Design an enzyme around this catalytic site. Structure first.
Site, PDB file in Angstrom:
ATOM      1  N   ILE A  90       0.819  -1.206   0.000  1.00 16.66           N
ATOM      2  CA  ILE A  90       0.000   0.000   0.000  1.00 16.66           C
ATOM      3  C   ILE A  90       0.855   1.258   0.000  1.00 16.66           C
ATOM      4  O   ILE A  90       1.644   1.475   0.922  1.00 16.66           O
ATOM      5  CB  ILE A  90      -0.925   0.025   1.226  1.00 16.66           C
ATOM      6  CG1 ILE A  90      -1.842  -1.190   1.190  1.00 16.66           C
ATOM      7  CG2 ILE A  90      -1.731   1.311   1.258  1.00 16.66           C
ATOM      8  CD1 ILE A  90      -2.643  -1.362   2.448  1.00 16.66           C
ATOM      9  N   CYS A  91       0.697   2.097  -1.020  1.00 16.32           N
ATOM     10  CA  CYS A  91       1.493   3.311  -1.083  1.00 16.32           C
ATOM     11  C   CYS A  91       0.760   4.533  -0.541  1.00 16.32           C
ATOM     12  O   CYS A  91       0.030   5.212  -1.264  1.00 16.32           O
ATOM     13  CB  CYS A  91       1.913   3.575  -2.529  1.00 16.32           C
ATOM     14  SG  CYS A  91       2.955   5.038  -2.744  1.00 16.32           S
TER      15      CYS A  91
END
Length: 151
Positions: A90-91
């Site tokens: 997850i960025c």
């Protein structure tokens, strides 16, 4: 004042008593003998993830909350999204540069929900000279990269 575990007990109870709509927190006992939480996330109405459930994995450090948890999608359903990788990564800035002890597991989940709701693009100042001059405050170039290849 609070310890790492105390902070998580507080957070746990906050989310057992009243988690965000469509969210459920399930602490997972693991073979790693560390605290890892599983979160049930049903996609929000009006989004491209609506009605589908995705799971989150929160891996907590002993430094926590002075060191953000590793937060990745897990389970059998990883969402297709510009900030979501097929391996669950997850960025979000909340897990790196914007992390603060004043934040919460709840706020990370909410950040992920709003991420899926509205994908935001990265930007920089129009003054490229300025931008370059502020790059000395950014993280250094990474040489070794994690790979998803079968070993």
């Amino acid at each position: 004042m609070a310890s790492m575990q105390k902070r998580l007990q507080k957070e746990l109870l906050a989310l057992q008593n009243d988690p965000p709509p469509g969210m459920t927190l399930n602490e997972k006992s693991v073979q790693n003998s560390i605290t890892q939480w599983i979160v049930d996330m049903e996609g929000a109405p009006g989004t491209l993830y609506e009605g589908e459930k995705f799971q989150l994995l929160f891996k907590f450090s002993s430094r926590y909350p002075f060191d953000s948890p590793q937060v990745m999608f897990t389970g059998e359903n990883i969402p297709v999204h510009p900030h979501v990788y097929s391996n669950g990564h997850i960025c979000l800035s909340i897990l790196t540069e914007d992390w603060s002890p004043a934040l919460s597991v709840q706020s990370v989940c909410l950040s992920i929900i709003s991420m899926l709701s509205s994908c935001k693009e990265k930007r920089r100042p129009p003054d490229n000279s300025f931008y370059v001059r502020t790059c000395n405050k950014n993280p250094k170039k990474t040489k070794w990269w994690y790979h998803d290849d079968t070993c």
